[PDB]
Amino acid sequence: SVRVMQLTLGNSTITTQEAANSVVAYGRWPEYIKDSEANPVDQPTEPDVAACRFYTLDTVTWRKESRGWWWKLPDALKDMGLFGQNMFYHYLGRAGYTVHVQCNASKFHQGALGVFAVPEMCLAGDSTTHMFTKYENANPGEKGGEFKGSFTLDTNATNPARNFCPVDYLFGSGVLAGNAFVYPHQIINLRTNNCATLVLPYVNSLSIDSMTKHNNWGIAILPLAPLDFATESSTEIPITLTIAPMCCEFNGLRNITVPRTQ
């Protein structure tokens, strides 16, 4: 039925008994580069089962006060097994994804989470200096980031944070959040479903790019209807994020990249 599914990729399987169908972004399933759209001339590496499998990133907790969370792809998976290895050993890389967000509660809980997949999800910074966010802050990895309820300008001139300041109702980029529904999405309304499943093809203005310099997709999760339970002002339910890269192919092998951190 629309509600029961099983996803198998490599050596990993995911089962769900409360789905609300699955979304295939823009109606496009991920695919490899065709010869007619090929650019780099060298033989690509395609790890296949070693990289195209389900990786579970860290679990976040939803509370009445949560504003939202965000992650960047392939960034969030840079340290994930052999996918991360191939990402750092190659100059160029390409991949699609199957994003599976998990969140179960009970029949006496309420709340709705909007799960959006955004191509080129550029976020707003914290200073008066334009495009000032530094690489280390823009790429948090598997832990991702969070949305805020208001904009707060960083004034420390001696030691600028050079970080993002994504305000939730402004979708972290100066647009109204209610219009974010034009992007592939699903809603995890506690009275209806457990999860959200989105299949994302590779989207870019090029056939292949640098995975370290460029993040193709952004995953934004916003509480559309806040978490509430029985009478417990105190309520916490975890949100686990499991993502699997698809049709990975890398070009331009050399020595490994070791990016600067923190």
Partner: protein, 272 residues
């Protein structure tokens, strides 16, 4: 101006054929492609060399002269036709030894009052007369030579779109020579040193003649100056014998050099 070949997929090799090894002493360049030294994938090539054709490389109007006339002998000026008065077009032409093409000349004319608060003049008309080598050159801005009964003239009205005319291949040889390793005279044994001496690399003393420019209106005591910028574009181009481009500053009409003889910067041998 066409397509480039596709990249064919290439796998591993273990053979007695070694395209990587060669011997440049022969004077030939090794025609290798990526698949000769690495494993390649099949790529359908869609890039073309449409913009690097000899025609597209020269298909631009380049400035070759700025003729100036002061409508208050300066009432008229004469410019000896050449492409060596400027450096940009000259350097591009000199990638080749010989050339053959037609020419398109566009004239951009500007004028202005020298005085911010003095004088006035009615709209000016200019006459650009071509004086082929041999024809009488004007001595005054208004002598008989300006009747142009045979010389081609162009009358330009100030403010009108730039004037433009086409000239056929006018060389007396089968192609224009960008380089001429010789003289116009051979000094003979016995003659005075003053005799038989000529410039090295020069052909005719007057190759293509010159342009005589003047303002046709009667000059008013007002101080005015006009400038005619000449733009030339080679069209229907054919070129022969490539040469390395000019690396140091030009020093005259010849290949002479003097000043910027150290064009390259310093860089460590093992510095990326």
């Amino acid at each position: 101006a066409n397509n480039l070949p596709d990249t064919q997929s290439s796998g591993p090799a273990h053979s007695k054929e070694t395209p990587a090894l060669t011997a440049v002493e022969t004077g030939a360049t090794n025609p290798l492609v990526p698949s000769d030294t690495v494993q390649t994938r099949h790529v359908i090539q869609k890039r073309t060399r449409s913009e690097s054709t000899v025609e597209s490389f020269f298909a631009r109007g380049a400035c070759v002269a700025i003729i100036e006339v002061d409508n208050d002998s300066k009432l008229f000026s004469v410019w000896k036709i050449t492409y060596k008065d400027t450096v940009q077009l000259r350097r591009k032409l000199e990638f080749f030894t010989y050339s053959r093409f037609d020419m398109e000349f566009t004239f951009v004319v500007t004028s202005n009052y020298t005085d911010a608060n003095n004088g006035h003049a009615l709209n000016q008309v200019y006459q650009i007369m071509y004086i082929p080598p041999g024809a009488p050159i004007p001595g005054k801005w208004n002598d008989y030579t300006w009747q142009t009964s045979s010389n081609p003239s162009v009358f330009y009205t100030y403010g009108a779109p730039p004037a433009r005319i086409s000239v056929p291949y006018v060389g007396i040889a089968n192609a224009y020579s960008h380089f001429y390793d010789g003289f116009a005279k051979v000094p003979l044994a016995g003659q005075a040193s003053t005799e038989g001496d000529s410039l090295y690399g020069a052909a005719s003393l007057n190759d293509f003649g010159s342009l005589a420019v003047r303002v046709v209106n009667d000059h008013n005591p007002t101080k005015l100056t006009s400038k005619i910028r000449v733009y030339m574009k080679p069209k229907h181009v054919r070129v022969w014998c490539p040469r390395p481009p000019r690396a140091v500053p030009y020093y005259g009409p010849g290949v002479d050099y003097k000043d910027g003889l150290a064009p390259l910067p310093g860089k460590g041998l093992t510095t990326y």
